[PDB]
Design a protein around this ligand. Structure first.
Ligand SMILES: [Cl-]
Ligand SMILES: [Cl-]
Ligand SMILES: [Cl-]
Length: 110
């Protein structure tokens, strides 16, 4: 038994969020919660939100015991890009792509 949760279109580049999910991969739920709470890394709040959503799914929808949960999988996929329009530059269009993040957290039982 395992419980999943996903957060889409997070406005943070995948690279930065990956640095965050890397800290919690394989940890117990309690440990992951603390790491997220005290980490200085940008995007920690979004991963924390997905973590709690997965915990709510495991405990309330799948009746799993909260004290047995650990982060079985946590990863970030590249989501759709946002094409930010910049002021004209030397007569030309200036468009830069800003990538969003797709975050997945899967909780399992030890
Ligand atoms: Cl997405
Ligand atoms: Cl990843
Ligand atoms: Cl990659």
């Amino acid at each position: 038994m395992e419980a999943k949760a996903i957060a889409r279109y997070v406005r943070i580049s995948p690279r930065k969020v990956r640095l965050v999910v890397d800290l919690i991969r394989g940890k117990s739920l309690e440990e992951a919660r603390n790491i997220l709470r005290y980490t200085n890394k940008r995007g920690a709040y979004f991963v924390a939100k997905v973590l709690e959503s997965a915990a709510a799914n495991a405990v309330n929808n799948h009746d799993m015991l909260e004290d047995r949960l650990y982060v079985k999988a946590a990863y970030v996929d590249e989501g759709p890009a946002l094409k930010r329009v910049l002021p004209r530059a030397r007569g030309r269009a200036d468009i830069i792509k800003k990538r969003t993040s797709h975050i997945t957290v899967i909780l399992g039982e030890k």
